[PDB]
């Protein structure tokens with residue numbers, strides 16, 4: 286039987302049509318990717334089931350007798366840089382996952398996030414002043430990208446004379462191309478080196494930022510974060526702040542710009558914004574794929590997945606499963622979006638949801654509430670989508686401010 290190759294253009298060009306074709310045939314099928322066999326889950330019920338079954342591990346560090354685990358997200362990473370990337374909540378299983386998440390949740394709170402609202406609003410205003418009131422600009426470079434970066438750097442106590450470079454490395458890591466495995470491995474070593482220096486500097490000069498708080502957080506029973514745990518968690522938070530919300534804002538802008546009717550609703554009624562953000566996430570989920578490792582043989586949707594198999598849960602495909610979302614390919618800011626898998630599901634449910642929703646709502650409201658005639662600078666079909674199954678997005682988006 287023909288086995289799909291996630292590297293082919295079928296998974297990067299009008300790819301939701303490809304997912305729909307595989308789903309109708311089999312919501313759980315074997316695929317090829319980066320020279321390795323794996324299983325792709327595209328059905329909603331199957332994806333939800335997979336993410337809820339703890340026999341499917343999230344820890345790339347675990348060793349199993351006679352098997353060589355090589356996960357996509359760590360293509361080209363030397364073993365030591367891999368460990369620095371994989372010693373945090375997202376890359377661990379209970380009970381380790383449990384204590385790491387409890388310690389971090391003590392400081393990465395809704396209160397702390399809400400306290401940043403005025404600042405996020407100020408930063409948004411300043412960036413929009415800087416773009417002008419007429420002409421064509423790349424809204425990604427001048428807005429969608431700088432906003433989340435400034436926010437996450439103030440949250441983690443990262444200086445300006447350190448940014449710019451980091452963003453160059455982040456971008457390389459989002460693409461998984463075997464021809465550039467070496468450059469990817471090099472960019473990853475750069476980020477590890479940067480984080481190590483940042484942490485050490487913070488231990489020496491404490492502040493009221495999140496990294497400082499994480500450094501002294503401790504619990505009677507759970508103790509405190511080890512040096513390695515601290516380092517990996519900081520790395521992962523900065524990485525998420527540098528790339529996740531950029532996709533949301535850029536993709537969000539492109540969608541509202543290509544659905545005039547939908548944009549009107551938002552403009553007409555502001556209370557319709559929070560749900561618009563949820564539908565945007567539902568329609569084109571940035572984390573198109575999340576990975577799991579079958580520590581035991583598991584059955585998903587009637588299909589038996591052999592032990593030691595790599596499972597790619599396609600969060601994005603599941604969001605377009607007609608069985609859960611009627612008329613899936615229809616972008617509708619009013620539909621009921623409950624249950625989408627863009628923020629995950631279960632114990633690893635994304636801890637940054639509050640921050641992402643804040644940035645998304647504030648940015649889009651300000652952007653469109655300030656450029657009534659804002660329109661796309663190019664033809665809708667000419668937009669270039671980033672070729673990443675790790676984090677989908679738009680790197681360049683020209684828009685005409687004055688119409």
Ligand code: HEM
Pocket residue numbers: 343374375376386521522523525526529530533566570571572575576600626627628629630632633634635636637638640641
């Ligand atoms: C558009 C924005 C975002 C989306 C769509 C998103 C999506 C996701 C998804 C799907 C997962 C679960 C992955 C899995 O099950 O393996 C996840 C986990 C996580 N995300 Fe996000 N995320 C976003 C923003 C953020 C932000 C702003 C931060 C932090 C500054 C962040 C921090 C995390 C962490 C720490 C985890 C691991 C949670 C755990 O394993 O317990 N995310 N995110």
Ligand SMILES: CC(=O)N1CCN(c2ccc(OC[C@H]3CO[C@](Cn4ccnc4)(c4ccc(Cl)cc4Cl)O3)cc2)CC1
Pocket residue numbers: 342343344345356357358359374375376458459521522524525528529572575576577578635675676
């Ligand atoms: C077994 C295996 O291969 N692994 C690969 C993916 N895994 C993972 C890793 C980290 C994670 O914290 C979210 C931190 C970690 O994940 C990213 C993706 N992300 C963004 C927001 N929420 C998730 C991320 C991760 C890796 C790479 Cl290379 C790039 C990026 Cl932007 O940011 C949560 C889960 C778990 C499964």
